Every structure is written in C-alpha cells, then in structure tokens.
Design a protein around this ligand. Structure first.
Ligand SMILES: N[C@@H](CCC(=O)O)C(=O)N[C@@H](CCC(=O)O)C(=O)O
Lengths: 286, 167
C-alpha cells in the first residue's frame, strides 16, 4: 500500500483486476485475469478465439507481446477467413516470462463467471441484436433465448466455455492448442492440427518516441503505434489546440493530420520504427 | 476489440488491446467461444491492425491508454491526448467529449453540428455525416499515475459501458 488501479471495458473485469491488485499482485497477473474475464463477460469484443497485444512498461524494462492470430496454410479458396488464435498462447507466454501467481488461479474468476453466470448489460444485449441477421443460428441459443437476444439483467451461463477454460487451467496451453479443443477448432475453421499446434507469440521492442515532454511507448508494426505517434506529434507541432474552440478549424486540421499519417503508413506497406517517429522524420512530413 | 490498462504498486503499467476483429469474429462458435475473423491486410503471418496500446511517461506522471474502433483508433486517440496534454481538463472529462472521424471526404460526427460549421467544412470538400452507433467512436480506457502522492486516476468510456478504479 502502495497505489494501484484498473481501467477496462466491463465492471466485472475492473472488479477482478482490483481483487488481484488488492491482495498484492503484479500488473501482469492482474492483466491475465482481466483478459480472461473480458472474453467471458464481454464475449463479443474479445476472447480465446482471437488475439491481441500487450505493452508492459516497468521502472526499468519495456516489452511488447504480440499474440495476434496468424494465417493458416490453405490451398484452394477462400477459405473462411479465420487466423490461428493467439490469445491463450499470449497469456501463457506473458505469464511464464513476467508472471508471479500460479496460472490456475489467474483463470479461476473467468471460469467462475462462465460456470455460474454473470448478469448481461446493455451493450451485450445490443451487440447480440445487431449481430442476429449475420450470426444467429440454433447453435447460439444460450445467447438468444426464445429466438431473441438475452435481455439486460438476465444471467448468462456458458458451460461449454467453462469446460474449455477448465481444460486450459488444468493443462496450460496444450489444453487449447492440442487435443479436443484443437480438433473442434480444426473442424470449424478448416485449419490443420499442425497449424494450430505451431502457433508462436512474437516479442518486439515498443516504438519509443516523445510527445509533449513525455516518453511515449507504443505498438510496433504490424500494430499502428507509429501512425498514432506521428499524428500526435504533428498536432503538437502545428498546435491545432489553438483551434480547439473553433470546431470547423479543429476538425479541418485533424482531417489533414490524419491523411498525412495514413498515407505515410500505407506506402510503408506498398526496418526501424523509431526512425519513422523522430522529430526529424516528422519534420520531413506533409 | 477491447482495451484495458493496469497500474500496480511499483508503477508497472500494462496497456493491452484484444480482439476478434469483427464483433463475434466470423460468428463461428465452438467449444464455447467465437472464432476470430481475419481481415486480409502467405501462411504464418499476422495482418496489419490499427490497434495501438500506448504508454506516456514524464517525471511525476505515468499514462496508459488505448481504444477499439478499427481504423479510427488513431483518430479517436489523437484529439484526446492533444486536449489532455494541453491542460484542457480531467482525462475522464476529455473521454466524455463528443467525437468525429474522417473517411475520405466524409466527416462522421457523434453529435449533430450547426449550419455555421457544416458550411465551413463543406467548403473544404468534406461532407459531415452524424453516426448512430456510439461504439463507432471507440471505447477509450486509460489510467494515470502521478507522484502526488501517489494518486491514480483514469477514464472509462461510457460508450461501451467502461469504467475504472484505484485504491
Ligand atoms: N467497421 C469495422 C471495420 C473497420 C476496420 O478498421 O477494420 C470496425 O470498426 N471493426 C471493429 C469492430 C470491433 C470494435 O470494437 O471496434 C474492429 O476493431 O476491428
């Protein structure tokens, strides 16, 4: 004690994060808990069937963990456009290299919400209603009881998911990337077993720059820390903040700053990121 | 897509964004979960994403921040960080401000704007369009640690029912 906090897109994820922190856990142990909770209670936006990236900045260490989905080998067309999920491998890697608490415990609060249920909020019921024309089928009946999106206030229980999470908790990453879960992914996604099994996380250096006196650390390619940092620095250079009170000016200049930086990003697809973000490189931009 | 930020006792900050790409990914569902949708941007490679988990550091200040919203991510975050660094007010306050993004000569707006403004922007070849989906403008989540002493504060984006807490 010790100051600490969590910001996240669901109150149950914030709650579980704070729980780990309250009892003296590290930011990365809390991060694994929150990520897994979010895949259960905010299932539309993330989960074990996807991927993502994590920036870890401590007093004297910087890391960026990249657990984004990777393309499978596939010979005909199209197929379904599904990458090998990287999320579960990501949390494991992060845990093995930066975690303290034992992994089983980090999965437990998500298991509990999947197992015993949580109360659905506005955004989830709305997301389900908006997705119904695209995704609805009878396989999805727990999400649409009585053919309608589960209502705000109802308890959603996810027994299949709890089972999967328990398999991971017991076996580690093998529980997802091999065995029955992997055969289910293989059958649904049309991705070979060997592809699922071969998933690897990439570790990368953060893009380091500065903005407004701040050292800024951000996400390197294939993420877009560069574009963001560029936009930030252009905006500080040509202080559009002096136009903040005049809406059309403010907007007008943002619009400019944004095609400058998006154009730049694109002819970087059509090897050092720290260069593309320096006061001199930014100097040379328009 | 979802973004979150954590700051612990010894000032380690984590800033992280996870995703299925689309809401529910491809909508394909197995062993309890939704399979991602992979946007095409060769076998074992990752596609480009606009995601950008970021940390800002000065002496006496640590900021973690990020947001979903696809290709609007840098457009969402730029104005907020701009307003914020230029002393315009509390981070939460700034997250609460109405928002706009551009797609090739269409300006998309969170809140409907005046004639005055709509004309001035029409004059630059842009055609204002107000958008219905509040989630279209992101879900910014942030924490701030300062060394007074220490206090953590932050922002949650009410557009995705987001929130934050510190001890
Ligand atoms: N309109 C889509 C695709 C645009 C893009 O930039 O890829 C979109 O905004 N997708 C997002 C949906 C989920 C979210 O939380 O924003 C995304 O982040 O991929």
């Amino acid at each position: 004690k010790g100051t600490y906090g969590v910001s996240a897109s669901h109150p149950l994820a914030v709650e579980e994060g704070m729980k780990v922190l309250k009892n003296g856990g590290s930011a990365v142990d809390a991060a694994i808990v929150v990520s897994y909770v979010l895949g259960v209670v905010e299932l539309h936006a993330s989960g074990i069937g996807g991927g993502g990236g994590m920036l870890i900045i401590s007093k004297d260490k910087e890391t960026f963990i990249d657990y984004r989905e990777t393309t499978p080998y596939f010979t005909g067309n199209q197929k379904p456009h599904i990458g090998v999920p990287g999320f579960v491998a990501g949390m494991e890697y992060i845990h093995d290299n930066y975690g303290s608490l034992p992994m089983g415990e980090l999965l437990q609060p998500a298991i509990n919400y999947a197992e015993k249920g949580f109360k659905v909020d506005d955004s989830l019921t709305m997301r389900l209603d908006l997705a119904k024309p695209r995704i609805y089928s009878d396989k999805l009946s727990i999400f649409y009881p009585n053919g309608e999106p589960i209502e705000t206030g109802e308890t959603l229980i996810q027994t299949d998911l709890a089972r999967t999470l328990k398999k991971i908790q017991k076996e580690g990453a093998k529980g997802f990337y091999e065995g029955g879960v992997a055969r289910a992914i293989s059958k649904t996604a049309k991705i070979s077993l060997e592809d699922i099994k071969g998933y690897k996380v990439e570790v990368r250096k953060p893009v380091k720059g500065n903005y407004m006196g701040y050292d800024v650390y951000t996400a390197p390619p294939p993420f877009s820390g560069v574009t963001l940092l560029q936009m930030l620095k252009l905006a500080e250079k040509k202080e559009v903040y002096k136009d903040v009170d005049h809406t059309a000016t403010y907007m007008s200049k943002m619009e400019e700053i944004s095609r400058i930086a998006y154009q730049d990003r694109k002819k970087n697809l059509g090897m050092d990121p720290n260069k593309m973000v320096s006061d001199k490189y930014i100097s040379t931009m328009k | 897509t979802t973004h979150f930020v954590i700051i612990d006792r010894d000032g380690t900050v984590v800033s992280s964004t996870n995703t299925l790409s689309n809401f529910f990914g491809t909508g394909k569902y197995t062993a309890g979960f939704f399979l991602n949708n992979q946007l095409q941007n060769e076998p074992g490679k990752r596609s480009r994403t606009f995601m950008a988990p970021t940390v800002l550091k000065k002496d006496g200040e640590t900021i973690g921040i990020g947001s979903p919203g696809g290709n609007r991510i840098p457009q969402i975050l730029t104005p907020i960080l701009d307003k914020y660094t230029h002393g315009k007010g509390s981070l939460q306050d700034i997250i609460n401000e109405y928002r706009f993004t551009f797609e090739k000569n269409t300006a998309y707006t969170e809140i409907q704007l005046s004639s005055e403004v709509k004309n001035e922007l029409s004059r630059k070849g842009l055609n204002v369009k107000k958008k219905v989906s509040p989630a279209f403008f992101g879900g910014v989540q942030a924490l701030i640690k300062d060394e007074r002493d220490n206090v953590i504060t932050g922002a949650g984006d009410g557009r995705r029912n987001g929130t934050w807490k510190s001890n």
